[PDB]
């Protein structure tokens, strides 16, 4: 079928789940706690084993009271409502969700391959075909998300897991939002912020296309296009309208990046009349077989070492903390729909 036809069917499936979300599909007592995989202001992600199946999953745990203090109630409700409704090869699968007196739980597909971030920092950088393979997956994922009126808002290597086949899975939907018009929230990661966010303007899906430019640059250079010791110095660089490329970047890559890292919204690729096709049809993607990528028929440039379904050697170690459940319900009204 045509891309328009495929996206229409994808919208029909998404809307049915978006309008009637799955709720309370498991319980904490159904999982065995193994190890902490990651932490942040959002809470933590724990490797767990579902006893009834023996399957391993990545359990994202948020403390309701802490979410409230961080003013992330609406953003957390967005995350879960969107995750339970989407279906795309390069999006992490939300297997179950539930809450208790203290916490919110999102049980996700576990990717033992770990974060792109770890591999990128260790290796140093990815060659252009390696970076292109990952970039093609993001282009397709954003075409899918944007067609559903979803804005992603936190693209970065920290948020991209590598599966057992070397393909990537977008995981973090903490700032994702379903919005038809413009939006105004100051959110994201300093290095990845589009100028219109820094400048407190109403912005749209074009911020994700700018973030794609930052990701491609970081993957291919080994460092981001705008970096400094403090966020303020990063913002000054972003808004300056200037970008420098490593001498090893191909002419095609520099041209694509100048069109993505474009301060002018009337000129930013992804944001023109031709939409995503300006990106897909760029010289840098001439060797990309978009269908073969979607169908996962392309041989991956890198396969993470497989050491078991529950091995954590591709993850850093974190201090292990108790999962406390109060005897009293906290923030019941705020998270009623979760």
């Amino acid at each position: 079928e045509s891309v328009k036809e495929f996206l229409a069917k994808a919208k029909e499936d998404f809307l049915k789940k978006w309008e009637n979300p799955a709720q309370n599909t498991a319980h904490l007592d159904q999982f065995e706690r193994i190890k902490t995989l990651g932490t942040g202001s959002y809470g933590r992600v724990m490797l767990v084993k579902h006893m009834e199946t023996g399957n391993h999953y990545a359990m994202k745990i948020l403390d309701k009271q802490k979410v409230v203090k961080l003013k992330q109630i609406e953003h957390t409700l967005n995350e879960k409502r969107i995750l339970q409704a989407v279906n795309f090869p390069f999006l992490v699968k939300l297997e179950f969700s539930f809450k208790d007196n203290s916490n919110l739980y999102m049980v996700l597909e576990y990717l033992p391959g770990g974060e792109m971030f770890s591999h990128l920092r260790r290796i140093g950088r990815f060659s252009e075909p390696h970076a292109r393979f990952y970039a093609a997956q993001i282009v397709l994922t954003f075409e899918y998300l944007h067609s559903l009126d979803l804005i992603y808002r936190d693209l970065k290597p920290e948020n991209l897991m590598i599966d057992q086949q070397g393909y990537i899975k977008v995981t973090d939907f903490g700032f994702a939002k379903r919005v038809k018009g413009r939006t105004w929230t100051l959110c994201g990661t300093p290095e990845y912020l589009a100028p219109e966010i820094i400048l407190s303007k109403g912005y749209n899906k074009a911020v994700d296309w700018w973030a794609l430019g930052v990701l491609i640059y970081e993957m291919a250079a080994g460092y981001p296009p705008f970096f400094a010791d403090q966020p303020i110095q990063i913002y000054e660089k972003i808004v300056s309208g200037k970008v420098r490329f490593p001498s090893h970047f191909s002419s095609d890559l520099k041209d694509l990046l100048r069109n993505l890292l474009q301060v002018d919204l009337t000129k930013r690729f992804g944001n023109l009349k031709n939409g995503v096709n300006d990106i897909k049809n760029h010289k840098w993607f001439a060797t990309t077989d978009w269908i073969a990528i979607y169908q996962r028929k392309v041989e991956a440039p890198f396969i993470p070492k497989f050491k078991g379904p529950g091995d954590t050697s591709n993850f850093d170690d974190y201090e292990e903390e108790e999962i406390r459940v109060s005897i009293n319900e906290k923030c019941g009204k705020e998270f009623s729909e979760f």
Partner: peptide, 20 residues
């Protein structure tokens, strides 16, 4: 080099989302 400057910077580890 730009690489040396990045490696010596305080932002080579996992980067946190912003808060207001």
């Amino acid at each position: 080099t730009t690489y040396a400057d990045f490696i010596a910077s305080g932002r080579t580890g996992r980067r946190n989302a912003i808060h207001d």
